[PDB]
Structures are given as structure tokens and as C-alpha cells.
Design a protein around this ligand. Structure first.
Ligand SMILES: C/C(=C\COP(=O)(O)OP(=O)(O)O)CC[C@@]1(C)[C@@H]2CCCC(C)(C)C2=CC[C@@H]1C
Ligand SMILES: C/C(=C\COP(=O)(O)OP(=O)(O)O)CC[C@@]1(C)[C@@H]2CCCC(C)(C)C2=CC[C@@H]1C
Lengths: 289, 289
């Protein structure tokens, strides 16, 4: 269990990997769907929906219980009117399309939505329809317990929301809410800290307030989210589960004088080595090294 | 100004780089001091203090206005009693040592402290001394306006703190606090979102609640924080300022059929390329690729 080689891990059947993940984690994984337009212009609503389902299905079939997936951020008013409509149409799909609803039922997925969407969403018919669809879905899938899916819609800044939720909670309860109750209030249900975040391109994380910690393993694929392969996910999983927090930890004092020199050389050999710096090609940033 | 080459940027005098940063940013930079014991066991309280000052001085002399530096996290009770004492002694240095106090006065630095240190700090003499020292320093350097320095002591989970701060604010004010007021309450003064985070080793961020956004450029050096060189910082600065958000943005539609193929190849050439996966050597994780 604690002694599986990366090669074996990569050769293992899906049901075997899932069992390992159910026991070792990650329990909660953040996976935003970025670089969609780019992916489309290389390989719309019905195409992205399929890929989203593919990846989401992939994540859940690997044992991951909860998936936090940011889909819409405030940077949505940075585009025309046709975007708003098209956007709300995509949001509607998440709660109305038959193939995805079957996905929730097939894999018993409880869908929840977080963010400042109720306020920031265009105060109009189509917008209210989405909100109602979101609430409806959340309750519809309440019976599902195998997996939890959290969609981020304007879920980048929780400060004000937490503040107002705490004030109301204190007014009706008589005491301030616990961290647990604060999280249930934002995500609609309790969710453990994120164990990993899988982004792409520029090194940056976003849209998963209150669930971040120094223990959230970060990963940045070179290609867009939808390009995620089976091999890539397993390599990410393996790294997090067996490599990030290695044990027994290092004992500097008990090491020989040579081991220390070899270690020091690993750092001073390339004294200015940095991960995060990139280069631009056609306006697109690519990580170096 | 908007057309400086990386080479020139690297050749430019310090006062020139600072001027560019004062105009283009980053305005707020997160720089935690990690891998200290490791650095020490390769090159204690008086040694780390010097390096911390070196780097802090480096950051400020490059134009950075605010530096958020996490120094102590809850993972402090993961060690013996001698650690607690030694730790509170280091904390005391930040507010009592003469060379660092001169540093604040020399570079006009306003020092602030954030985190759940008032509660979690050992309810004892030495602990209360630190807390008082912290409050004292914060007020002592209130006249300084050139730079702002925020030290993170148990500043990983702000949820409960924000909740209680909002309840009290609403009770005395009659209305909930704004995001701005919520941030002033946690950090003791208003601070803009973090423009970049410079970590090391394992890809992960931490201890800068409420100040994170998708625009927080992440960087992970291979060697410990104290190994930070002049060249490395400039390469990081340059990347953030001129490369992260390149402009004009890309126009897929207006590109030739070949440019699109070259771009697609940049992604499918190495289909499973991932940044964040590593390898272990002597219990120490090192990023691959
Ligand atoms: C945020 C966004 C585009 C921003 O695009 P970048 O993230 O900026 O990528 P780039 O830089 O390559 O253009 C729109 C989301 C989108 C594509 C989502 C994506 C997942 C869920 C689903 C419901 C399938 C859906 C349906 C249609 C809808 C328009
Ligand atoms: C958090 C901590 C050690 C954890 O060490 P890792 O971050 O775990 O590094 P590793 O893994 O290599 O052991 C103690 C902080 C330390 C070294 C700080 C560091 C900056 C500020 C200053 C005041 C100079 C100070 C004085 C003395 C004090 C003990």
C-alpha cells in the first residue's frame, strides 16, 4: 500500500488506483476548466461540455471524492453581451442537459454551486432561471453520496460573503459560527481543505476560498485543461500521494559529510534556477526550464 | 518603459529597476522564509536574521512597496519545548534587535503582524512579551510610509477571525464591514491583493489570507529562500511585469493556418508535460523537468 512503485501505479487497473486514492487521498481536488477557447481553436458549448464530463468522470473514477471546479469568474464582464448569454447557456447546461444529469445519477454526484453568482448574475429572466436551476440541482442530487462536485461561479472573493453570513448566523444563533459552519455556509456543505490544484499555463491558483493551505499540492500542465490524459493524472496523483510528504523526513545531523555536499551541489550547481518564469509565443505564455 | 528588454533589465542599475517597479509593480509581494534549517546546515537566530534582512532589503530596494512574509505557522507545535522558546526569541528579534530596527528606520518600514498569534501564542510571560512587542512595533513604525512589512504568525486560516471581526463591527457600526475594512482588520491596515508569491521547493502557497487572486504570479525557486540572488529576483520581476500579462492578447482567428499548427505542436509535442511533479533525494523533494 505505502510501497507501490510509480511504474506499477501507472500499470495498475483503474479500480486499483481508485482504491489507493480512497485510502491515501487526495480527498479534495481543485480542477478549473481553463484554455477552453484555445482548445476549441485547435481540436463549442456541446464540445466543452463533453470534455468537462470526460475529465470530471476521470477524476471521480480515480477515487477523488470531491472536485472543486471554478468555471466562471468576475472576469466575465470583460467581454460583450453575446458572452453573457452564451455563458448563462453554459451554466444552464450544467443543471439541465440530459447527458450530464445522467452523469450525476450514474456516478452518484452531489452538485453544489459557490460564489457571488446570486448577486453578480445579470438581474434578468435568464439569470434568475440559472439561479433557480442551481438551487434545484443542489437539492436534486442531495441523495447522492459517492461524489461531491462544486462549481465556482464568481467564487473568487469570499470575504464580504463570510462577513454577512457570520453576522446573520450570530444574530439568529447568539454565537459566531465555527470555521466548519462558515465553510458549510459558503459551499453549501462542509468540504475539507483542497489536497491539490491542477492548473495550466501561467503558475497561478484561484477560486477556491477558505479551502487552501500549504498542503494544497500545486500542479501546472503545459497544455489546456481538456488535454488532460490518463498518464498525466496518475503522475500527478502519484507525486502528491507518495512524494510531496515523504517519510521518514530528512535527518541532516545523521548524514555523512559527502551526502551533505551532494545535496548542497544540487542547489548551488544551478544557483539561479527558478520555476515560474516563462517566455511568450504568439501572446501565449509558456513556462521555461 | 513598456519596451525594456530582459537583458537591459538585468543590466540596469538598482535605482532604475526600482523606478520601473514603482510604476509597473508588483506593489505587493509575498515572500515566506522557508528552508532555514536546511540553509543553516549547508552554509542560527543571528544568521537567519541577517539573511532575512538581506532579502527584505533587496525586495524593498527594488521598488516593492509591501512585502507579506509568513514566518510562523500552526505547524510550530509539531516540535519540542526548546522550539517554542527559540521561536519566541526569533519573534522578539523582529521587534527588539537594533540592526533590524535600524533597517526599519533606514528604509522607513511600517511593520505589521497578522495571524492568530494572540490566541495561539503560549499563554505565558514570554508569549505576552512578544505580543506587546508586536503591538508596540506596529505603532512605532506608523510614521514610516516608504514600505510596509507584514509578518505572518499563525496567519493561515482567517475564516474564524473574519467572522468574529465582522460580528463586532456590525454590532458597533450597525452595518457589515466592506471587504476593505475586513482586510484592514486582519492585517491592521489595507493591503492590495498579492501580485506575486515567491516560494521554494514543493509547489505550494500559504499564509496570506484574503490577498490571493488568479493574478498572483507564482514562482518556486529550487534552492532555499535565503539563497535568493539578485539575478533570480530580476528574472522573476521581469517575468511578472512583462510576460505574465502580455498585450495585445492573442487573436486566434486572425492567425495563419501554420501559426496555429506550430502552436498546437507546442502542446502535443510533449502531451503529458507537467510542472509540479518531482523526485525525492534524501527525503528532499525536487521539481522535475
Ligand atoms: C470562462 C469561459 C471562457 C474563458 O476562456 P479561457 O479560460 O480564458 O481560455 P482562453 O484563454 O484559451 O480563451 C466560458 C466557460 C464555458 C466555455 C464553460 C467551460 C466549462 C463548463 C461548460 C458549461 C461546458 C462551459 C460551456 C460554455 C462556456 C462558454
Ligand atoms: C518556522 C521555523 C523553522 C521551520 O523550518 P523550515 O521552513 O521547515 O525549513 P526546513 O524544512 O529546511 O527545516 C523557525 C523560524 C526562524 C528560523 C525565523 C526565520 C525567519 C525570521 C527569523 C526571526 C530570523 C527567524 C529566527 C529564528 C526562527 C527559529
Amino acid at each position: 500500500m505505502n510501497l507501490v512503485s510509480e511504474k506499477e501505479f501507472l500499470d495498475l487497473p483503474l479500480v486499483s488506483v481508485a482504491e489507493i486514492v480512497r485510502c491515501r487521498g487526495p480527498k479534495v481536488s481543485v480542477f478549473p476548466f481553463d484554455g477552453t477557447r484555445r482548445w476549441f481553436h485547435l481540436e463549442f458549448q456541446q464540445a466543452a461540455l463533453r470534455q468537462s464530463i470526460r475529465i470530471l468522470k476521470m477524476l471521480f473514477e480515480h477515487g477523488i471524492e470531491t472536485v472543486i471546479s471554478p468555471i466562471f469568474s468576475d472576469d466575465l464582464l470583460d467581454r460583450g453581451d453575446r458572452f453573457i448569454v452564451q455563458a448563462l447557456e453554459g451554466m444552464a447546461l450544467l443543471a439541465n442537459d440530459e447527458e450530464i444529469l445522467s452523469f450525476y445519477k450514474e456516478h452518484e454526484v452531489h452538485v453544489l454551486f459557490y460564489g457571488d453568482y446570486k448577486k453578480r448574475l445579470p438581474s434578468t429572466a435568464q439569470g434568475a432561471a440559472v439561479v433557480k436551476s442551481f438551487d434545484d440541482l443542489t437539492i436534486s442530487t442531495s441523495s447522492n453520496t459517492e461524489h461531491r462536485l462544486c462549481f465556482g461561479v464568481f467564487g473568487n472573493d469570499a470575504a464580504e460573503s463570510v462577513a454577512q453570513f457570520s453576522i446573520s448566523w450570530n444574530e439568529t444563533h447568539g454565537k459566531p459560527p465555527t470555521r466548519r459552519e462558515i465553510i458549510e455556509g459558503y459551499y453549501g456543505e462542509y468540504v475539507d481543505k483542497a489536497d491539490m490544484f491542477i492548473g495550466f499555463g501561467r503558475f497561478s491558483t484561484f477560486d477556491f476560498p477558505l479551502l487552501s493551505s500549504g498542503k494544497t499540492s500545486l500542479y501546472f500542465t503545459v497544455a489546456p485543461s481538456y488535454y488532460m490524459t490518463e498518464t498525466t493524472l496518475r503522475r500527478i496523483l502519484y507525486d502528491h500521494i507518495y512524494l510531496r510528504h515523504f517519510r521518514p523526513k530528512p535527518d541532516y545531523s545523521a548524514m555523512s559529510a559527502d551526502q551533505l555536499n551532494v545535496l548542497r551541489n544540487r542547489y548551488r550547481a544551478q544557483p539561479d534556477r527558478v520555476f515560474g518564469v516563462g517566455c511568450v509565443h504568439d501572446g501565449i505564455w509558456f513556462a521555461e526550464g
